[PDB]
Amino acid sequence: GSSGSSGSQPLLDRSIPDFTAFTTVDDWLSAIKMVQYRDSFLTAGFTSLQLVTQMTSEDLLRIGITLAGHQKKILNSIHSMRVQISQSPTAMASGPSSG
């Protein structure tokens, strides 16, 4: 038939959510519509976002999350999380002996 016409390309997200408005996995996931994986992280051992901030796409496939379309959202959040919360700056630096 003659339906399904779009006169515009897929733009990006200009509006950014509040990364500094979380506290727990159940809450965080619920803020990204990914609450469905609230048990995947819980049982996996990741009860605090502080532990998820140091995770990766691999960890998602380890707990069960194997949806490329879903991981795109999680990682997109985790990356911004570690940056905002959890102060984990560079470690391996400076001279071999200083103090």
How would you describe what is shown here?
The chain has 99 residues and is mainly alpha-helical. It has a domain at 23-82: DNA polymerase, domain 1 (Orthogonal Bundle). Helices cover 41% and strands 0% of the residues. The longest helix is centred in the last third of the chain and has 17 residues, at 68-84. The radius of gyration is 18 Å and the shape is extended. The protein starts with 24 loop residues before the first helix and ends in a 15-residue tail after the last helix. This is Ephrin type-B receptor 1. It is found in: Cell membrane; Early endosome membrane; Cell projection, Dendrite. Belongs to the protein kinase superfamily. Tyr protein kinase family. Ephrin receptor subfamily. Residues 20-84 form the SAM domain. A motif (PDZ-binding) lies at residues 91-93.
Order of helices and strands: HHHHH
Question: How is the main sheet built?
Answer: none
- The CATH H-level superfamily of the domain at 23-82 is Transcription Factor, Ets-1
Instruction: Give the oligomeric state of the chains in this entry, treating copies of one chain as homo and distinct chains as hetero.
Output: monomer
User: How many helix segments?
Assistant: 5
Number of strands: 0
